């Protein structure tokens, strides 16, 4: 049961993200509302979890949820700003720009093959 929750405050993101679990045949639960999200990660039921938006104020409480869980969580905006300040406070969480629905269904597939393993550079030499 490897609890895949995908976040997403606009539904037609929610739609590509499901789209690329329909194709693939991925394991997603996909949810519009954060404040639920939080309290799924209160109780630690998500084993790995994606959230797109812009809104920085889901975007850090999720991911300080994510610590106390010790859960894999992928980081999706359109602003590199609010993605690299995600990097720099945070070592350990998975990141990646996601302006358009493709990009962020992308990320997710990404993530999903690898088993959460999405944000690594050439690591290995």
Same mark, same amino acid.
């Given at each position: 049961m490897g609890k895949v929750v995908f976040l997403s405050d606009d539904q037609e993101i929610i739609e590509e993200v499901s789209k690329k679990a329909e194709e693939e045949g991925y394991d997603i639960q996909t949810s519009n509302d954060k404040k639920e999200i939080i309290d799924r990660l209160k109780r630690r039921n998500i084993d790995m979890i994606i959230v797109k938006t812009e809104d920085k104020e889901s975007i850090? &409480? @999720? @991911? $300080?949820? #994510? %610590?106390?869980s010790g859960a894999k969580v992928l980081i999706l905006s359109s602003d590199e700003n609010i993605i &690299? *300040? @995600?990097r720099k406070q945070y070592? $350990? #969480?998975e990141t990646r720009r996601a302006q358009d629905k493709e990009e962020v269904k992308d990320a997710v597939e990404e993530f %999903?093959? &690898?088993?959460? *393993? %999405? &944000?690594?550079?050439h690591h290995h030499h």
């Amino acid at each position: 049961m490897g609890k895949v929750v995908f976040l997403s405050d606009d539904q037609e993101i929610i739609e590509e993200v499901s789209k690329k679990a329909e194709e693939e045949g991925y394991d997603i639960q996909t949810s519009n509302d954060k404040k639920e999200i939080i309290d799924r990660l209160k109780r630690r039921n998500i084993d790995m979890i994606i959230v797109k938006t812009e809104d920085k104020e889901s975007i850090s &409480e @999720i @991911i $300080k949820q #994510v %610590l106390d869980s010790g859960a894999k969580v992928l980081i999706l905006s359109s602003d590199e700003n609010i993605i &690299e *300040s @995600i990097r720099k406070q945070y070592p $350990k #969480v998975e990141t990646r720009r996601a302006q358009d629905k493709e990009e962020v269904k992308d990320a997710v597939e990404e993530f %999903l093959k &690898e088993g959460g *393993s %999405l &944000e690594h550079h050439h690591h290995h030499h």
